[model samples]
Each structure stands twice: as C-alpha cells, then as structure tokens.
Target: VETFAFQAEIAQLMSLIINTFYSNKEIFLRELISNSSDALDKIRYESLTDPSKLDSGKELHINLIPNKQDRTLTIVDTGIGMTKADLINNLGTIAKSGTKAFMEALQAGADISMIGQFGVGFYSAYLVAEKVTVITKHNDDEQYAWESSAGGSFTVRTDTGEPMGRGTKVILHLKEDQTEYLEERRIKEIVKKHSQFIGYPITLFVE
Candidate 1:
C-alpha cells in the first residue's frame, strides 16, 4: 500500500477560498470542465508519441452525469489518469485540478486568495460539495479512487467500481445549498455558458 498527506482541507480555510473563487458558484462547473480539457490535452499529446499509453478504443471527451437521488454531480473523462505516484505528486501535491487543491493551499498560509496558482481551482468543487470522490485509471497503473470530505485530509486507494481503463471520474456529493447542479437543464446551460466550444463531445447524461 502507498500513502500521502494532502496539503490542507477546506475546513481550515473554508469560507476564505470559497468566496474568493466559487462565490460566483456556477464557475465551479467551468473550472472542472476546463481541467478535463487539460487532461484530455495531455493524453492527446502522449498518444502522438506513445500511443500504447492510451487505450485502443479511447473516446476523448468529458461526461457529466447528475444524480438527484444521491445529490451528486459526476464528471468523467477519457484522458490520462495519474499513476499512484502521480496521485501523490499532483493530487496529493499540486494540480490545477479540482482533483484536490483548495485544500492543498492551507499549508502555504495564504493571506490573498489562493488564486489557481496550479492546484486550487479544483478545490472549488467544495464550494458546492460537502464531499468529493475521484476514481481514475492510468494506462501504466491500476484504477485508484481519491476522496475528501472537505477536511484537512483526503484519501487515495484502489477503486472497486468499474474500471476506467484510462481516465478519471470525479463525483461531487452536492451540498444542500447547491443541489441545483443536479438538474439536467442546469448542467446543459452551464456547459453552454462556459465550455460548449470544447472540441470533443462533453455530454450531460439523462440518468
């Protein structure tokens, strides 16, 4: 088994970063979708030089599936999933991904807003989620799941759910205050407002 210490959690510096970035609220979806595009970009670059690093039938895109029953917003991407070490370095360390960052900044003791230096954008998910779960699989490694409850710590372990083959799925357990994100029309509008120009298909599912 492997191990790590996430920089920090939302609780320590909660309202500070949330109001700084997610105060607009809907921007949370934009940040997450933008990150998916970046992950897709990285995987696409890897494909040209090292195609085996990608699955034979990989579909490059981000998918949004909302669940009102569970009050969750799930965004999955067929891009480059990080290995264990990667989880430590990026997710555990620093990523421009909501993969876990707002929580990452507290270790720095910031006075100004920890404006998306490279890791905090992803933390904005906490703006609307009390908890977040990420399941990812890399061509070089087995599937792993990373989770956080908006605290000073987060965990990464093997994923028992379906294999991603080569990508990541971030499940945001929506907070009572931000449950509107679970609606299909709302997701559709958010995609259109901030990320519709994306090259690949970014679908919001019915289920």
Candidate 2:
C-alpha cells in the first residue's frame, strides 16, 4: 500500500550488482541461502518476545529443488515472508532506500534493528533465472505470489495453493546457459562456501 522512489545512485548500484556479480554466478545460491538464514533469525528473535510468532515447526532450513523437465530451480524456506508492500518496495524499486531511512530512524531514536536490509541481493536472482516466481505467506498476511523477469516491471497477486505455513519459496526458471546451477553438488558447494556460517541447514535436490 505504501510507495516510494529509489535514490538515483542506489538504482545504478543495483544494476551494477546484477551485471558484475554474475562473474561468480554460484554466489547467487549463497546470497539466497544467507537471506534465508537472516529471515529465520528474524522469526527466532521475534519468537523470544511473542511465542505465538513461532509458526514453522521444523528447524530453519533452505531447500533447493531442480526441475530438469522445466529447467527450473526452486529455493524454498520456512522463514519470514514479505508483505505486498515489501514486494513493491524491496523488489519493484531499485536501490531501495530503506537502509538509509532505517538509519535515519535510528538517529531519531527508533529501535528497529530487527528489520533486515535487502536491495541488490534480491535482484541477483535475475542472473540465473530468466523468470522468477515467489510464493510467500507472512504471519500477518495472506498468501501471495510475486513474479518478475528482471525487467523494470513485476507482477504480484494472491496465490491459490496450499498455504506455505509462514515463509517464502523462490522458483527460478533457469536459462539454458545457466543449467549448471541445477546440479545438486554445485548448489551444495556454493551454499557451504558462502553460507556455512549461517545458522540454518541448507539442502540441495536434483530432479
């Protein structure tokens, strides 16, 4: 429901992140896995204050599913899901200035450290996936699906499927040239390298 503009330099920075980072394309998996761990940390911390916030029964984990028939790889997690406004502000806009705004709020005596800053890493999905589908359900919101193609515009709408408890699933429609990302070994190695320090389990599946 809320809307805002991205700072110009931040937008350019995001573009560079997507273009230049692909040189080590495997890092995309690492980035996504690290994000999942961060989401789990948020929910865990919130549960300390409100036990009811603990919805996902299983230990925090990330699952990588590769669909060879469709050439799609999915990264799923039972962690914090984004609201519609979050999708717009975090994904739709480039160089989301939320980080700066949060810092400003901190200066003004706002205690909002629980919020995780996301910008360039979200767009990194475009490097391997020609198209992406995000199925997510937040604790206080209905299930939703966000779709994008790395273009300037993206589509978001209510989802029609079994509710995903409380978390997010990112499905990447892999490009022909990027099929190596579908290999279980490759995905696992990437996750272990860049995200082993993360406090969650990561699994990779090839199909």
Candidate 3:
C-alpha cells in the first residue's frame, strides 16, 4: 500500500478547482479525454525512436463507456501509463506542469505556445466524479491503480488483475447531478465537438 501526497501549492490549486470549476462540468470529460489523447501521442512519438516501447501496437484510440445503472462514465485510452514516481510528480504535485513556469514565461514574453505542457488537465475529472480511479500499466514497469476523491488527498496501490498491457483507464463515479453525461448521445456529441480532429479514433458505447 503506497500513499501519495500533493505539493502545498497543488493542494491550494485543487481547492480552487473543487470550489470554482464545477459550474462548467461537462468540460471535465472533454479535458480528461483530451489529455488522454495527448498521452497516447506522447508515447507514439517516443515509439518512433524505440518501436518496442509501445506495448500495444493497436492504433491509438479513446473509448467512452457509460454504465447508466451505476451512473458512471469511464474514459479509456491506449496511452502512456505512469510509474509510481510519475504518479506522484504528475498527479500528486505540479512538478512537470509548465503551469507556473508558463505563467512566468508569459509574463516575461516567452512562448506561451506550449501552455498545456502541464499535467493540470487530469484534475478536470474531479468536476464530475465524486470518486475517480485511474488504472494504469506501464510497459517498463508493473501495473498500478490510483484512486482519489479530490477531498485533498489520493491513494495508490498495485492493481489486482493482469496488467492492462500499457495504457490508462479513468473511471469516473459521476455525481448524481451530472448523470446526463452517461447518455450515449451526449457522450457522442461531446466527443465530436472537441475530439473529432484528434489524430486517434474515438468510440462511444451505444448503451
């Protein structure tokens, strides 16, 4: 059992997220899935230098699976999975995110062209989920699962089943008010709106 801690600033940022961002909740799914697509793109680029780095050669794609009975929506991807260290630094802290630096650089007239270089995109999931579980498998490491309620902390541990090959699965335990996102038509509309141009295929479960 491993415990993860967020940096002090990240904790503050998350407070702002929970208190301020819920007004526009649907964007949460869009942002999270978009981030997943970017993760897939990252490893795809890396695979160019080392073909074996990609655990699954299946084309990069995103899947939206809605379980109406449970009022949950899952965003899945064949993308780069984070290792323990990455989980901590990427999610538990703001280390890799160029957010702060991007702001500073913008102030100093540096290129803001790469603003999304930060990992803040994942936190968008909290907008709709009362609880979120991230199941991931890294090609070079063992499988791991990270769970959080965004109430100020998170938990991480080894996964129970066979490793996920290599990718990430984000299960969003939706809030009662946001259950409409579980509809197939709604999910399809959102995907087409924000991700139709994405380099990967996007699939929505037909319920």
Candidate 4:
C-alpha cells in the first residue's frame, strides 16, 4: 500500500521548478543519489565515534528500485534518517546564506556541499516525481512518513508497518511524462555519469 499522500503547496513550488529551474529531468536522480551518499557517509562517520548510532547489523548501502507497473522509483539507504523536526527543515529550507555563502565558499575554497545547506538538491526529486513520499526512522526519532506534491502544504503520518530501523526510504511517484526514470538502463547511466565516484555502492534493482 502507498504510505503517503500529496500536499499542493510544495507541489506548486516543485511543479514550478520542474518546468523552470531544472533543465534536464534526469538530473533529479543525480541530486537524489548524491544526497543518499551524504546520508550514508554521515551515519558511518558518526558511527566511527559512536557505533551505536548506526544500529547494529544494519546494511549501509543505497538501493534503487524501479517499478514500471506502478510508475514509481524508490531509493533506500541505511543511513542517518530524519526526525519530525528534520522533516520540517527538509521540506524546503536548508540554506545558510543563499548566494552570499555560496560565493564565499567559492572564494575561500570550501566544500560546496555547504551551499546546499538549503535543501535545494533534495527538492530536485520534484523534477521527475509529481508526488514524493519519504519514510524515515532514526535512532533518535520515531519512524514516520511525509508526503508532498510540492505544493503549499504536505502531510505527516506514522508508519503502519513494522519499524524501518535506522534509515531512510524515498518513494517517487513518477510523473506520467517522466516514466523514463523507471528504466534500469536510464538510471544506470545517470548514476554512472553523476555518481560513479561516490563512496558507496549504488545498487539498481529491476526485480
């Protein structure tokens, strides 16, 4: 069963981006996958200092599942998941200083990842998915789900299934016009082009 529904506010915002900000719809996967790597790295890095934060026996990898029948693509990672507060921040804002901070990072030679302090890349999923659902369980937070069509508002709910452990799962309801995202070959090349050098294994699933 689908775990979440859509909110039109963020939907409206993302719809505008899909049509304007993101030039290539395929780039959405790149952004989404990169963030997955960040999540995994954060958890593992933290685990080095505090192993219990990673949850014992949890698999730390990314799984890309294509569902043509349902016109959905799912990306899962056994990484540091989000809490309700994190979800609120993740819904849109993650920026620290906008273009000013971005320019400073460039001038001083800093990790550009800081520029994404505002959740812009995460919202790129809106490029291909009309509706996006996020299910996350954190060691320090409850297992919950969030959904938004990228409109003005979204929904929050508790998971009905068994716990998801310490990880995050993102389900993208592909737009009718963006079903190419559900193709295995398509996803492979995007990962190859954009995420080939990323630290973790990015597994593609057609089954």
Candidate 5:
C-alpha cells in the first residue's frame, strides 16, 4: 500500500467541515449520495462519446449496504470510479488556489453549500465514520482501494474487493453512536429527506 498526506489545505478543510457540520451529521449521507450521483452522471456522459465505457454491463445506480453486524455502511455506485492518481488528487488535494478563499467562506459560516462545491464533501464522512475504505475501479484503470481514518493522511493500494466491476464502493465504518445510520428506517428517512430527487436509483441492501 502506498501512503500519502492530505494537502495542508485539505487537512485543515476537513477539520473545519467536521467541526462546522457536527450537528448536521445526516448531511454526510446526502453529500455521499450526491457524490455518487455525479460519478454516475460522468460515466453516462463519457459513454456518449465512447460506447466501450458502458461495456461492463453494469446498470448505472447506487447501492447502500448497511451491515449491522459489521457496524459499517457501504455506499456502492456503478459510476466512474477513480484511478490511483485520481484517488490522490481527488481525495488528498484541493488542487485549487481558491481553497484559502473557500476556507474563509466556510469560516464565515457558508455551511453545507460550500462543502461539495469545493469537492471536500467526501471528508464529511469523518463526521460519523471512524474509518472509510473506498474500493474503486475505473473503466480504463485497474481497481484500487483508498483507506483512511481522516488522520491527516490516506493510503491507496491495488485491490480486488467486492462489487468488482466498474464503479466505486465506499465503506464507512460507522461509530458506535452513529449506528442509527445502520437502520433501514433511518436510511429511508434520510434518502427521502435529502436524496429522493437524485436522478439515479439508490438501492439499500439490508443483508
């Protein structure tokens, strides 16, 4: 496994988000679903130009697996997954000079609107999960897993984990108090409240 540190700006941004949105923990699920929706949209757009991108025969959708026994909630999306480089660039660095300004806006109380806009919504997973493991496969790249505990760095390694086709699967190791997310009724409520209008279908697996 290869390890990398979060860019200074991103590390600070993560702490800011977690602290800022602690009361609105449910928004983490919404942010994640929104990310999945964007990933699915990307593959659809890419498929228009290159038909082979859709050759995996996987229907485009999102799956949420609430494994009560394991104390984990997995969000799987049959969308454009990331490459190793992407795992680094997308998760570690903001890659924007405007991050300082964004942080300022966040500090100024801009709220959840500012989270996804800067692509830092993924960090919001730390609000509930003690650890997050992302197993992903891009159409043109081999599968990779990005794992982290939001401890200022993350690790990425070649992986052949479950849902092995083209897509991304994010496994959030939920905290003890955050176990409410592992309940079917609670997830249904969150989906209805936040992501019901998302275009892609979201399947919740009880088993």
Candidate 6:
C-alpha cells in the first residue's frame, strides 16, 4: 500500500467546500453519478477510435448498492477506469491550470451547481461520509483502491478484494448523521430529481 499527502491547495479547497456546502448535501450523489457519466463518455469515445478499448466485456451502466448492514453506499460504474498516475494527478493534486480555474470558481461565490464543471465535486463526498473508498480497474493498469477520510492524506493499494471487471467502484462509509442516504426511498427520490436524464442506465439494488 502506498500513501500520499493531499496537495496543500487541495486540502484547503476540500476544507472550504465541506464547511461551506453543508446544506443540500444530497448533491454529492448527483456529482458522483455525473462523474461516472463522464467516464462512460470517455470510454465510448475512445472505443470508436480504438475498437480494442471495448474489449472488456462489461457493458456500460451505473449500479448503486446501499449496504444497510455495513452502513455504506457504493456506486459502481463500468466506464473508463483510471491508471495509478491518473488517480494521483486527478484526485491527489490538481494541475496548475485546473487549480487556477477551480480557485476562480471558488472566489466567484462557490456555486454548488458548478460541481461537475470545476471537478471539485468529488470532494463533496466528505459532506456525508467519514471515509470514501475507490476501487478501480483500467485496461492499461492493475486494479487499485484509493481510500481517504477527507483528512490530510489518502492511501492507494492494489485491490484484491473482488474482481472488479472494468471501471470504478466508490464506496462511501456514511457518517452517523448521514445514514438517511442509505435508505432506498431517499436514494430513489434523489436520483429522480438529479439524474433521471443521464444517458446511461442507473440501477439501484432494492428489496
């Protein structure tokens, strides 16, 4: 297992976002789904130019699992998963240009609606979860698990828990006060309100 400290600016950005966007914490779901949609989009586009990209037999879709026993909610996407460098660069530290752009948006009043556009939407997970785990597999790299608690650092390790065919699985360990998100009815309501129009199929496992 390897660990990395959050870039100083990213640490500051996450703190500001969590403290400032406590209301409507439900947007975390929407932003996560939106990110999955974008990943699916990338694979779709890439497969067109290089047909071998679709060799992974996984079909395109998003799956949501609410684990009541574990008090965790997992969002799984069969999309363009990340390589180790991609995970580090994209999630650990923002590129200079991205940091500048994101900071501009932050100074422009921190609009929750701009979540996807600014790419800081991922940080919103801290709003409801004390910890977040990402297990992802890409065609070019081995499966990796990225875990963070919105703390000063995060850890990445080779994933051996399950055979994640191809794409990303985000597991959120819900905070005590945020367990409402683990409810089926609440998930359905939020999905309908925010992501009904997403092009990919979104499935929620329910009893």
Please tell me which predicted candidate would have the highest lDDT against the true structure.
6
- Candidate 1 residue-wise lDDT at 50: 79
Estimated TM-score for each candidate: 0.81, 0.78, 0.84, 0.80, 0.91, 0.92
Off by over 4 Å in 5: 19-21, 95-99, 112-114
- Per-residue alpha-carbon lDDT of candidate 1 for residues 1-207, written as tens digits (9 for 90 to 100): 344545543334444544554356777788788778888898999889977766534689889999988989998898887787776665544442432344455446643334445555676777788888888888868899987775456678888887667888889999898988998888888889978798778888997
Alpha-carbon shift of residue 95 in model 4 (angstroms): 4.1
Candidate 3 structure quality by residue, lDDT tens digits, 1-207 = 776666765555555556652355666776777788888998898999988886465567888889988878988888987887778665554543444664465458543223344556566676678898989877877788888887667888889876577898999999888888998888777777766787787888877
Q: Rate the local accuracy (lDDT) of all candidates.
A: 0.73, 0.69, 0.74, 0.72, 0.83, 0.84
Stretches > 4 Å off in candidate 1? 1-4, 8-15, 18-22, 95-119
- What lDDT tens digits, residue by residue, belong to model 4 across residues 1-207? 233322433444345455653346676777777778888888888888897785534578989999988889999888888888777654434432343444455468643334345445676677778888899987877888888775456777877766777788899998898888788888898889878997887889975
Model 4, runs deviating above 4 Å? 1-15, 21-23, 89-119
Off by over 4 Å in 6: 90-104
Candidate 1 pairs with clashing backbones: 9-151, 98-122
lDDT tens digits by residue: candidate 6, 23-109:
788989999999899999999999988988888844999999998799999989999998999778765565434555777876778
RMSD of 6: 1.8
Better of 2 and 3 by TM-score: 3
10 residues in a row with least lDDT, candidate 6? 91-100
**Tens-digit lDDT string for candidate 2 (116-202):** 343346556766778888898888888888876643456778888887888999899987899988787877777767777777777
Model 3 TM-score is 0.84
- Would you list the rank order by lDDT, best first? 6, 5, 3, 1, 4, 2
| Model 2 TM-score (2 dp) | 0.78
